[PDB]
Write a protein that binds this DNA or RNA. Structure first.
Lengths: 136, 94, 141, 38, 176
RNA sequence: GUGAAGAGGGAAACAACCCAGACCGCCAGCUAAGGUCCCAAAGUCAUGGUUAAGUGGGAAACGAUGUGGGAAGGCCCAGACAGCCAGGAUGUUGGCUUAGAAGCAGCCAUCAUUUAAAGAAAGCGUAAUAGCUCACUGGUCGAGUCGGCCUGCGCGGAAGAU
RNA sequence: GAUGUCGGCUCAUCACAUCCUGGGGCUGAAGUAGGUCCCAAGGGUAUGGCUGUUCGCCAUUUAAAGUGGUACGCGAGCUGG
C-alpha cells in the first residue's frame, strides 16, 4: 500500500459521505480520467495503476497526481472476537466520489493517453471515462 | 460561431429544472451589463455537440430568442459531473 | 522458402561470390552457376573500387545461361569515400561521421547516372543527397 | 476450444465470427489465435 | 442490401415451378432444388423468380438476398460439378474407385468408403485424388468435407488430406 | 415505525416489510394496498413502442457489425463502399552487428527519386538476404456508406452437492 | 427439564470445479508418449509399514487409485483407539 508522509492522527472513521467533488475536471493536463463510480481504493490499486500508466506514455508525457490515501482504517485479524478492542492499520483508503480525477496526461497523442489509461484503470475497480480538456 | 435556437423559460426551481432536461431543454441565463437577465432554455442535443468544439467557448454565439438575437459569449458551463451532458450554461453578453 | 524469380538483384564483393550460402541456396538453384559467375565477377572488380558489397543484377535464363550487368560501386560507398570515413557509417542520424559538399554529390550522380531514375542530373543529385542524409553524413555546403 | 473471454485482436486474419451467442475467433493464418468464447 | 435488391435471374434451359415458399426448379441441367425459405414472397415474371420481404418480419429481406444466390447456385450446381480434385499429403492413404464407391484410408486396416448419393457421379483415374462431378453445389460440398476431415494439414509438416489449400508453417520440431 | 400487546388484506407462505386498526350480527354495497391467461375472484383490455434470451425469473470486471431510437461528424454520381484489372519501379539484396544479419533477430536509416500510384515496409520465409503476400495508390464497378457519441432493450461472462 | 465429540469399521448416496475410460481444440504437435485447455457424472476409482489422526510421510502396484457435500455422512448398526 501507499500511505501519507506526514500525519496528525493514526486512526480514522470509515466515513460516509455523499457524491460530488470540487476537482471534477482537469486543470493541468489535456487528458485525464475522471470517475463514474465511487468506493474506496485499497492503495495497491493506485500503485498498480501508476505502474501501468507510465509504461506506455514513456518519458514523452507529463504527469500530475490526484487522489491521495490518507484515511487509515484498521483491520482486526481472524480468530479475534469483534468489538473487543480495535485492530491495527492494515488499510490506507482513499474515499472517492463521482467525477474524481485520477491522473492527467499531456504532451502525448489522445490515442496514446487512452491506451495508458485503459491499462491503468482495469487495475482500478470502478468504471472510468476519458477527459479532454479542450480549452476549458 | 453557432447560431442556436432557444426560447424563454418561465419555469424555475430544481423540480422543473430536472423535468426540463429530460425533454432536451436545459436552463441557462444571459446576463451582461445592467441589462435585464434573460432566463432561457436552449436545446440540449444541439448545444451538446456544439460545446464539444472549442468554437463555442471562444467565439460570438448568437442565441435567437423570440425572433430577436442576442450576441453573447459562453462564459461558464455547468456540465454533468461524469457525463458530457449539460445542466446549465452561463452566457455573458458580447 | 527458397523460391525465387529469375531477375535477381544481389550485392557481393569479390571472393563472396565463390560460396553458394551467402548468396542463398535460393538463387543458387537457378541456371546461374556459382563457379562461372565468381571468376567472371572477380575479374572486373579489380578495375573498380570495392570494400563493401557491390550490386550486380543477374538475369537468369532457362538454358542454364545468364548475363549480368555489374553496376558501379554504391552511392553509399562513394559518399563514405568523399566523407573520409568508410566501412559503414555505424548507426546513421544519431551522430555525425562525415561531411559531403555539393560538388561531391554532383560527381557521384553523374557516375551512377546509368542505373538511376531522374528527370535531370539535378534530380539524380538529390537522390544521392538523400543517401548522404540517410548515412548520417551532413550537407552544410 | 481454449477459453479466453476477451476477443481483442491478434491478427488481421482473425475473422471474429459470432456463432451462437458466443463470439469465437476462427483464424486461418495461425490456429493459435482461436478462442472458444468472447 | 446489395444482393437483396439485385435482380434474380432464371437462365435459359432452366424452368421453375409455382411454389409458395419452396424453391423447386425443373428441366434438365438444373432440375433439383428443394430448399426452403420462410420470409420470401415467391412472385414470378418470365425470367425472374422474384423474392421479397414477407409480412410479420423486418429482416425478411435477408431471406430474399439468400434465395437469389441460392437459386442461381443450384442452376450451376447441376450444370457444373465441384470438388474436381481433392489431394493429400502422406503416403499409404491412396484411393480406389468402383464408379460409385470411392475408397480412402490413412493407412487403415480396413478402407473407409462413401457410397455416393443418387444423382451424384464420380470417378477418377488418379488414386490420391478424388474427383466429384455430380449435381448440386451443396450435396457435393458435404461429401467433399467427409473426405478431408479424416486428417488435415499440420502447422509443422502439412501431412494430412488437403483439398486445394493448406495452412502450414515451418515451426521448429523439438526433441531433435 | 412496527411487533411486543393487532387480528384482517398484500408480499407463494414468512412476529418485525407494505396497506389498513377488527363493539356485534347481516349467503348487502364501495374502495385501499395489491391484482385481472389457467390453477384462482376480475382486462388473453384499449393505444403506441421495445424485446426472442423463456430475457423477464441471481451477479460484476470485462468482451461483442446483437437490435431499436436520437443528434452530430467523415466519405459519396467531380463515382464512395465490397469484389475484380493493376502499380507494385529506382539510387538500394543501404549501414551496424555477423564470413554472410544488408524491409521483415536485435540496433540504425525509415531520406530522395519514378509518378495516376509504388514503405528502403506488416507478416510468412531465410541466422540474414533472396521470394510470396500487404496496410499504400490509379482504373473497372454503380448507390448509398464508415466509425465514434448520447440512449432503450437484449447477448456472452454465469460451475454444486436428496 | 440430555441434539452422544473425533477417528476407524460397516454400509453408502449425491454434486462436478473430472483422477481414469469416451469425444475434441491448441501445441514449442518429429514419431512416441505427453503438456495445456474444452465437453462429459454412464460406469470405474489399490493393498500394506508408522501414526487414534481425518490428513500426512513411506513401500509396492494400477487404466486410475479424483475432489467436496451427506450432523468435518453413517455409535436407537459395531468398536471406544
Amino acid at each position: 500500500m501507499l500511505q501519507p508522509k506526514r500525519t496528525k492522527f493514526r486512526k480514522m472513521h470509515k466515513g460516509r459521505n455523499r457524491g460530488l467533488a470540487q476537482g471534477t475536471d482537469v486543470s493541468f493536463g489535456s487528458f485525464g480520467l475522471k470517475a463514474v463510480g465511487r468506493g474506496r481504493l485499497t492503495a495497491r490499486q493506485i500503485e498498480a495503476a501508476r505502474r501501468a500508466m507510465t509504461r506506455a506514455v514513456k518519458r514523452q508525457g507529463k504527469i500530475w497526481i490526484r487522489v491521495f490515501p490518507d484515511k487509515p482504517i484498521t483491520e482486526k485479524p481472524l480468530a479475534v472476537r469483534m468489538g473487543k478492542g480495535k485492530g491495527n492499520v492494515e488499510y490506507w483508503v482513499a474515499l472517492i466520489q463521482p467525477g474524481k480525477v485520477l491522473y492527467e496526461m499531456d504532451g502525448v497523442p489522445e490515442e496514446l493517453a487512452r491506451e495508458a489509461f485503459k491499462l491503468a484503470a482495469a487495475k482500478l475497480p470502478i468504471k472510468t471515462t476519458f477527459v479532454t480538456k479542450t480549452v476549458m | 460561431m453557432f447560431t442556436i435556437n432557444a426560447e424563454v423559460r418561465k419555469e424555475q426551481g430544481k423540480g422543473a429544472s430536472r423535468r426540463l432536461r429530460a425533454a432536451n431543454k436545459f436552463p441557462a441565463i444571459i446576463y451582461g451589463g445592467k441589462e435585464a437577465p434573460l432566463a432561457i432554455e436552449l436545446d440540449h442535443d444541439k448545444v451538446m455537440n456544439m460545446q464539444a468544439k472549442a468554437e463555442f467557448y471562444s467565439e460570438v454565439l448568437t442565441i435567437v430568442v423570440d425572433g430577436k438575437e442576442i450576441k453573447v459569449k459562453a462564459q461558464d458551463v455547468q456540465r454533468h459531473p461524469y457525463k458530457p451532458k449539460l445542466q446549465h450554461i452561463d452566457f455573458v453578453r458580447a | 522458402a527458397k523460391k525465387v524469380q529469375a531477375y535477381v538483384k544481389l550485392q557481393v564483393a569479390a571472393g563472396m561470390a565463390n560460396p553458394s550460402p551467402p548468396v542463398g541456396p535460393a538463387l543458387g538453384q537457378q541456371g546461374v552457376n556459382i563457379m562461372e559467375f565468381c571468376k567472371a565477377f572477380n575479374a572486373k572488380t579489380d578495375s573498380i573500387e570495392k570494400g563493401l558489397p557491390i550490386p550486380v543484377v543477374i538475369t537468369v535464363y532457362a538454358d542454364r545461361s545468364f548475363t549480368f550487368v555489374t553496376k558501379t560501386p554504391p552511392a553509399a560507398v562513394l559518399l563514405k569515400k568523399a566523407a573520409g570515413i568508410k566501412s559503414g557509417s555505424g548507426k546513421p542520424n544519431k551522430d555525425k561521421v562525415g561531411k559531403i559538399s555539393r560538388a561531391q554529390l554532383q560527381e557521384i550522380a553523374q557516375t551512377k547516372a546509368a542505373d538511376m531514375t531522374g528527370a535531370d542530373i539535378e534530380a539524380m543529385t538529390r537522390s544521392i543527397e538523400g543517401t548522404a542524409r540517410s548515412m548520417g553524413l551532413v550537407v552544410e555546403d | 476450444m481454449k477459453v479466453r473471454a476477451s476477443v481483442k485482436k491478434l491478427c488481421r486474419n482473425c475473422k471474429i465470427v459470432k456463432r451462437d451467442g458466443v463470439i469465437r475467433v476462427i483464424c486461418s493464418a495461425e490456429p493459435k489465435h482461436k478462442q472458444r468464447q468472447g | 442490401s446489395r444482393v437483396a435488391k439485385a435482380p434474380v435471374v432464371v437462365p435459359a434451359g432452366v424452368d421453375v415451378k409455382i411454389n409458395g415458399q419452396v424453391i423447386t426448379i425443373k428441366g434438365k441441367n438444373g432440375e433439383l432444388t428443394r430448399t426452403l425459405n420462410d420470409a420470401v414472397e415467391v412472385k414470378h415474371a418470365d425470367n425472374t423468380l422474384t423474392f421479397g420481404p414477407r409480412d410479420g418480419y423486418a429482416d425478411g429481406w435477408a431471406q430474399a438476398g439468400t434465395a437469389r444466390a441460392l437459386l442461381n447456385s443450384m442452376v450451376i450446381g447441376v450444370t457444373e460439378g465441384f470438388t474436381k480434385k481433392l489431394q493429400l499429403v502422406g503416403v499409404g492413404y491412396r484411393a480406389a474407385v468402383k464408379g460409385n464407391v470411392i475408397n480412402l484410408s490413412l493407412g487403415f486396416s480396413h478402407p473407409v468408403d462413401h457410397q455416393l448419393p443418387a444423382g451424384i457421379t464420380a470417378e477418377c483415374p488418379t488414386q490420391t485424388e478424388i474427383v466429384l462431378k455430380g449435381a448440386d453445389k451443396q450435396v457435393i460440398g458435404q461429401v467433399a468435407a467427409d473426405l478431408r476431415a479424416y486428417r488435415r494439414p499440420e502447422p509443422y509438416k502439412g501431412k494430412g488430406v488437403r483439398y486445394a489449400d493448406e495452412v502450414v508453417r515451418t515451426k521448429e520440431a523439438k526433441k531433435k
